[PDB]
């Protein structure tokens, strides 16, 4: 690895690698725009010019790789005159919009103008200005403030994969706006609002609402997905303003989804505020928190043993599940019922690893073949789709659909039908089984959607066999519960059990109220009036994920936590705490009371959750799990259709997203 001199001191820099990366390695920071790691290099916007120790003319910092003991004077005066030189050109046309441009608080162009640009103007003519190009429900294009760091196109063609937008024209008048009126919708369309260098592209829904120096910037993680990406939520005092991605190598890496980016908006609208008993008329009616909780607290004692049946939503809630767990063991019998119709016989839970995504998503680029079965990756987990696409450019590795007609951005083999192509390749009937054989570190990915589909267990058995074959040849509200064994999780235990206890019936309340004629009563501990509330007696207001400290588990098994942000909106408390109240009322007061005591209870009942970033484990070994499941095996069927298919279907899932104004605006947008 070559020696190279940053201005003075020697640095044993990595072979090749751009001068920019060299000074980045010494930590000195060159002024920049068009360049961006996690994107691509480009020669436009020559604000990065730096002076060679000897060679008379400056060269772009992100262009030339360092070599052979180079020295480079970043602070050299000629470099500085160069930078002023360029900056005056950039400012020769960017419109006087700082007070109104929504990028105004931290636009990189401002700070670069301060640190380097000459302060006097000496342009003295007429700026060009151009008409807007409407683009979708989200992004507020303004252009004119455009500076042709192509960047956004290099975003689109190289990550979103859509190449709808692009540069147009030559000289001045050239525009980064797409020709033709056509709207650009994509699942990574939101992140450009982050990526856009200036205010030329900024989020309409958040627009004008706030200014950057104002908002506090809490760190946490997303909940709209179990993908568990890190974020920086931003609040203007007692109220959330806008979400931004927080970079993290294992997951989001500087990116974020899109449904999550605008998910917060639903919090503002309909939401639980006070407990609501059914009145004698059957109407929902507002009530004291105390009489309500004491009411049900006495009500559920008669049915100690089985009968009572708590029901979680798809979003909730680690501390709530431990708390409710003791609620269920201090009572003699219980219903650990999630929502997804996930098969449990043969037990993937006890070994942990079967429900785990074994390789790290960070390890996905290492895999040489991917076997997507049943559900399209982009809607289910966009960041992962971004990851595999990322490697798709980085590597020529194969992937395959098993099976759907879904439109992933990149080239990939399409297969047929479940038991068919699956069991066939499992028995090496498929030619695809061969390429799966020669493949290094094969990756087979099975979606959650497949796990239901009438006979989920059969599908799991087929995919597991493929795993066995490869080895022989050689060469939310989900993963958390299975980290603590709340299987079946499915509501299939029934056996009708009186007095169900929703944590959030907004999801599973759409199903059926069949127990209700037997027992109309349903405690509802949600945070929206959606679905579950109207068909449920006794309502408990509850906190959203922004408030709660409660951890969530990455599908990899990483179990990182959200931090507090804006406190519960009204009389509502954090969810579990209602239960720690309830047990205390029942007389079966639980051992914990503080959040940290019950983190000590994760420190017993798991204690692998209390390792927030630590995915690694001893692993049960796939063959042993295979033997563990070997004693079952059952009849299968061909069809396998992922739930989402269309993007509009992606826009609405959990009740919070349907409480969103903007997501409604998007589903209206794509449909109209």
């Amino acid at each position: 690895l070559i020696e190279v001199f940053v201005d003075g001191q020697s640095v044993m820099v990595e072979p090749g690698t751009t001068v920019l990366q060299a000074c980045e390695k010494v930590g000195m920071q060159i002024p920049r725009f068009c360049y961006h790691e996690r994107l691509s290099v480009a020669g436009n916007c020559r604000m990065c010019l730096v002076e060679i120790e000897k060679a008379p003319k400056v060269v772009a910092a992100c262009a030339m790789p360092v070599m052979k003991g180079w020295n480079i004077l970043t602070n050299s005066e000629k470099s500085k005159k160069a930078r002023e030189g360029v900056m005056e050109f950039l400012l020769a046309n960017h419109p006087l919009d700082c007070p109104i441009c929504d990028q105004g608080g931290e636009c990189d162009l401002q700070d670069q103008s301060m640190m380097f640009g000459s302060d006097r103007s000496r342009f003295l003519e007429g700026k060009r200005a151009v008409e807007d190009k409407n683009i979708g429900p989200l992004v507020k294009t303004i252009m004119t403030r455009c500076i042709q760091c192509t960047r956004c196109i290099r975003f689109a063609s190289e990550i979103a994969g859509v190449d709808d937008l692009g540069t147009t024209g030559r000289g001045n008048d050239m525009q980064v706006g797409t020709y033709i009126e056509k709207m650009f919708m994509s699942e990574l369309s939101g992140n450009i609002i982050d990526i856009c260098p200036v205010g030329a592209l900024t989020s309409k829904p958040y627009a004008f609402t706030a200014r950057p120096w104002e908002t506090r910037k809490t760190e946490s993680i997303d909940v709209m997905d179990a993908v568990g990406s890190n974020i920086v939520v931003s609040t203007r005092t007692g109220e959330v303003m806008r979400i931004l991605p927080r970079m993290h190598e294992d997951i989001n890496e500087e990116w974020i989804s899109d449904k999550t980016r605008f998910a917060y908006d639903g919090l503002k609208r309909q939401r639980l505020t006070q407990p609501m008993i059914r009145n004698e008329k059957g109407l929902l009616t507002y009530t004291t928190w105390e009489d309500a909780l004491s009411r049900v607290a006495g009500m559920l004692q008669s049915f100690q043993g089985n009968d009572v049946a708590a029901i979680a939503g798809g979003l909730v809630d680690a501390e709530a599940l431990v708390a409710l767990k003791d609620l269920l063991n201090r009572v003699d019998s219980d219903s650990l019922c999630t929502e997804e119709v996930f098969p449990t016989a043969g037990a993937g839970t006890d070994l942990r690893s079967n429900y785990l995504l074994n390789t790290t998503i960070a390890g996905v680029e290492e895999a040489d073949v991917i076997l997507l079965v049943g559900t399209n990756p982009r809607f289910e987990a966009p960041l992962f789709n971004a990851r595999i696409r990322k490697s798709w450019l980085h590597n020529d590795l194969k992937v395959a659909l098993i099976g759907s007609p879904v439109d992933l951005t990149y080239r990939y083999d399409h297969l047929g039908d479940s038991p068919k192509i699956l069991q066939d390749i499992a028995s090496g009937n498929h030619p695809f089984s061969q390429i799966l054989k020669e493949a290094k570190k094969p990756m087979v990915v099975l979606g959650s959607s497949a796990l239901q589909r009438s006979d989920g267990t059969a599908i799991l058995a087929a995919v597991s066999n493929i795993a066995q074959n490869i080895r022989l040849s050689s060469g939310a509200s989900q993963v958390a519960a299975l980290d603590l064994g709340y299987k079946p999780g499915v509501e299939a235990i029934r056996k009708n059990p009186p007095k169900v206890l929703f944590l959030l019936g907004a999801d599973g309340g759409c199903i059926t109220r069949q127990d209700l004629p037997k027992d109309c009563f349903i405690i509802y501990q949600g945070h929206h009036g959606d679905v579950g509330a109207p068909m449920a007696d006794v309502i408990l207001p509850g906190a959203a994920y922004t408030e709660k400290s409660a951890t969530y588990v990455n599908t990899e098994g990483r179990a990182q936590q959200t931090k507090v942000a804006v406190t519960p909106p009204g009389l509502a408390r954090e969810d579990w705490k209602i239960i720690r109240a309830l047990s205390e009322i029942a007389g079966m007061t639980l051992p914990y009371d503080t959040l940290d005591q019950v983190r000590s209870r994760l420190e017993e009942v798991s204690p692998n959750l209390v390792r927030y970033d630590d995915v690694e484990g001893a692993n049960y070994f796939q063959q042993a799990n295979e033997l563990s499941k070997l004693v079952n095996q059952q009849l299968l069927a061909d069809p396998l259709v992922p739930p989402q298919l269309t993007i509009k279907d992606f826009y609405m899932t959990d009740s919070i997203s349907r409480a969103s104004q903007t997501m409604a605006k998007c589903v209206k947008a794509v449909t109209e």
């Binding site: 920071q29 262009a63 260098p197 920086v232 500087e254 931090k563 406190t567």
Partner: protein, 107 residues
């Protein structure tokens, strides 16, 4: 431990926690300067609204407090001197990445 020396009410050396970390880059920015150097943010508490004028009236004594540092060990030890509960978090420097203008022109 210096809890007796500080006049701080017991409530706020007890029922709340510091949260040491090195701040993330604002992602809208391409800058890196503010990223470095440990700081010692406390946990948020309640903040309601003024019945009049709608102001964000607030109860907690010390929400806005924040402190820079040069080293993490110094920070942890710092809070320990104060007898403070803490949540130390890792520095998360980005992995170095390969870049090549010509790899764009493989074929």
């Amino acid at each position: 431990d210096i809890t007796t020396l500080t006049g701080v009410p017991e409530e706020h050396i007890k029922t709340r926690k510091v949260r040491i970390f090195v701040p993330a880059r604002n992602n809208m920015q391409s800058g890196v300067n503010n990223t470095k150097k440990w700081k010692m943010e406390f946990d948020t508490r309640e903040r309601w609204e003024n019945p009049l004028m709608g102001w964000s009236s607030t109860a907690d004594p010390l929400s806005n407090l924040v402190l820079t540092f040069s080293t993490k060990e110094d920070a942890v030890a710092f809070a320990e001197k104060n007898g403070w509960s803490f949540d130390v978090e890792e520095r998360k420097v980005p992995k170095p990445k390969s870049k090549s203008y010509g790899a764009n022109f493989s074929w």
